[PDB]
Amino acid sequence: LQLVHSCSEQSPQASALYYDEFANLIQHEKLDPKALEWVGHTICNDFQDAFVVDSCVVPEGDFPFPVKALYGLEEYDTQDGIAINLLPLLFSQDFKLVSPLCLAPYFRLLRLCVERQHNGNLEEIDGLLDCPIFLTDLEPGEKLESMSAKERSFMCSLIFLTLNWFREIVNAFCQETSPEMKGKVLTRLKHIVELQIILEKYLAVTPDYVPPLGLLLHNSHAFFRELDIEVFSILHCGLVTKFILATEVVQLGPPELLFLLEDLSQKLESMLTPIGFSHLQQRSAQEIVHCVFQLLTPMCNHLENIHNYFQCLAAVQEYHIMSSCYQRLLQIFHGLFAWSGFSQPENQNLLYSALHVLSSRLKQGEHSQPLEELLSQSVHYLQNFHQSIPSFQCALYLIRLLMVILEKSTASAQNKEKIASLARQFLCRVWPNISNDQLHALLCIYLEHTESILKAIEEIAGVGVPELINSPKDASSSTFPTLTRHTFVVFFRVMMAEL
């Protein structure tokens, strides 16, 4: 083991691959106590000797940007001597055993190894968490119009490794069940979100330049390290509205909710609907659906709260941020209910346990009832949210959600009529832009589930297009308000295909 470690020490990519693969191996397999504690002791010694340093800052390499303490425990003081010097080492190597450019795998090994020895109870790793990182107060270059030079390229390179570190730290500390420390990991969310804003600003000013790592949508899954499903146990914590408004404790705001929920949606859509990911695939498809299933009650309570928020608003950037959060939340719910495993009879009781709670969400104290009735008030409960649907693309997801939870149903005709009625409600509604494929899917399901397809086609044609030629160019007000020039072609395509 130490032979292969020393041989692979020089190569950074091969080293990082060794660290990540060995960490996965330790995670998903059992090792003997002596070898496990030996490798844990050696890697802990190497990590302590390499990166951990005194709180006093010693600049090296004569870098031009002054460095101040940031991104640490709020009650931090100079007495706590722990600190990390990732940026001096990156500046030195950019401009041999130490390799902070692959810092994230190293900590993962530590995050496994002590957990094998101590069975949790990691005070030293909590000390590693509590320390800050000394870095310049980095901001976008527009304050001085920073040209994309070598120094700016290095600074933009630093953001990915900082985000990976602050992602793996919350990956590590999610499982800890102590109440006081919870806000600490929430502060890490509050860090990475602003860093993510900073990250996309560096994509805005320099879209062409891309730092390496072993447009932002493509780069996010590739660069950012994966996270365990247990990380989404942080979503068990309740949220609080920020724009409108556990005192003196951080709480789940909207954008960290969007971030975690979008990561969950990417993972769920990648798995359930057949690669960029390598950690989730090792876990099977049965325990993961159980893990997200036990989590559905908190995120459904979040759906309730944000729906009530939008109802209260019904009477700036946070509005569409929460709207996109709503979109992603409905996407999670549909994707969870769209698993192909529920078709086969293996996990029917799991599906039933998915929806009894929903029934308890609507009318408390009802259980062990027939499945068709329970899903009937479940679809009624989902239908109650149809008013608080700000973004248009959510609506079709909700309609699709209804269909899948109404796929496993008996009274097909009534369900189809209800789906058609709600689709008509969405279509006739005005909206404030919109991808044509969303119109394609929505009109497809609407015309499919209407009682008379041919009558509906002639009806939409006669009511709309005569009104369109009567109406002026841009305004396409009719029974169908969304019948503008950027929509007529998909309308014609959908009516022709359904005909």
3-state secondary structure 399-462: HHHHHHHHHCCCCHHHHHHHHHHHHHHHHHCCCCCCCHHHHHHHHHHHHHHCCCHHHHHHHHHH
* Length of the chain as a residue count: 499
d(CA 418, CA 412): 10
Amino acid at site 410: T
List CB contacts of 498: < 8 A, sequence separation 6 or more.
444, 447, 448, 453, 457
- In the structure encoding, which two tokens stand for residue 130, read together? 């509590």
Half-sphere exposure of 232 (CA within 13 A, CB side): 26
Coil/strand/helix, residue 339: coil
Which element (helix H / strand E) includes 134? strand 133-135
CA dist list (Å): 290 to 341, 349, 375: 12, 11, 19
List the end-to-end C-alpha distance of the chain, in Å, as a whole number: 67
CA dist list (Å): 444 to 286, 382, 399, 447, 485: 33, 21, 12, 5, 19
165-184 CB burial, b ≥16 within 10 A, e <16: bbbbbbbbbbebeeeeebbb
Which element (helix H / strand E) includes 36? helix 33-50
CA dist list (Å): 153 to 98, 159, 211, 339: 22, 10, 7, 43
* Resolution for this PDB entry, in angstroms: 4.1
Name the pairing type of β-strands 133-135 and 52-53: unpaired
d(CA 449, CA 444): 9
Closest to 483 in 3D by CA, of 430, 444, 445? 430
d(CA 414, CA 93): 68
**Cβ(166)–Cβ(119) below 8 Å:** no
Amino acid at site 479: T
d(CA 11, CA 83): 26
d(CA 274, CA 25): 25
d(CA 75, CA 88): 25
Amino acid at site 37: E
d(CA 399, CA 442): 8
Question: Alpha-carbon dihedral of residues 54, 59, 65, 68, nearest 10 degrees?
Answer: 20
**SS3 for 64-92, per residue?**
CCCCEEECCCCCCCCCCCCEECHHHHHHH
**Breaks in the chain after residues (C–N exceeding 2.5 Å):** 95, 214, 245, 274, 315, 432
CA dist list (Å): 259 to 33, 72, 171, 175, 242: 38, 21, 14, 19, 16
Number of other CB atoms surrounding residue 277 within 10 Å: 13
CB-count burial class (<10 Å; 0-12, 13-18, 19+) for 479: middle
* Placement of tokens 């107060």 in the chain: 137
d(CA 211, CA 458): 55
Number of other CB atoms surrounding residue 285 within 10 Å: 12
d(CA 385, CA 379): 10
d(CA 269, CA 336): 9
Name the pairing type of β-strands 68-70 and 52-53: unpaired
**Cβ(198)–Cβ(138) below 8 Å:** yes
Name the pairing type of β-strands 133-135 and 68-70: antiparallel
* Placement of tokens 């979008």 in the chain: 262
Amino acid at site 263: D
- What Rg value do the Cα atoms of the chain yield, rounded? 27
Give CA 60 to chain center in angstroms: 37
d(CA 130, CA 223): 25
Which element (helix H / strand E) includes 52? strand 52-53
- In the structure encoding, which two tokens stand for residue 348, read together? 């029917």
Closest to 346 in 3D by CA, of 267, 284, 271, 282? 284
- In the structure encoding, which two tokens stand for residue 362, read together? 């609507």
d(CA 240, CA 253): 6
413-445 CB burial, b ≥16 within 10 A, e <16: eebbebbbebbeebbeeeeeebeeeebbbbbbb
Phi, psi for residue 97 in degrees, rounded to 5: -65, -40
**Cβ(471)–Cβ(478) below 8 Å:** yes
DSSP H helices in 56-211: 86-94, 103-117, 123-130, 150-173, 182-205
**Cβ(113)–Cβ(51) below 8 Å:** no
- In the structure encoding, which two tokens stand for residue 155, read together? 């600074």
Number of H helices, E strands in the chain: 20, 4
- In the structure encoding, which two tokens stand for residue 110, read together? 């530590």
**Cβ(459)–Cβ(408) below 8 Å:** no
d(CA 318, CA 255): 8
Looking at residue 24, the DSSP 8-state letter turns out to be H
- In the structure encoding, which two tokens stand for residue 70, read together? 């940031």
- In the structure encoding, which two tokens stand for residue 336, read together? 């969870």
Closest to 402 in 3D by CA, of 370, 376, 425, 427? 376
**Cβ(375)–Cβ(355) below 8 Å:** yes
List CB contacts of 49: < 8 A, sequence separation 6 or more.
none
CB-count burial class (<10 Å; 0-12, 13-18, 19+) for 190: middle
3-16 CB burial, b ≥16 within 10 A, e <16: eebeebeeeeeebb
d(CA 272, CA 290): 13
Number of other CB atoms surrounding residue 451 within 10 Å: 11
**Cβ(282)–Cβ(28) below 8 Å:** yes
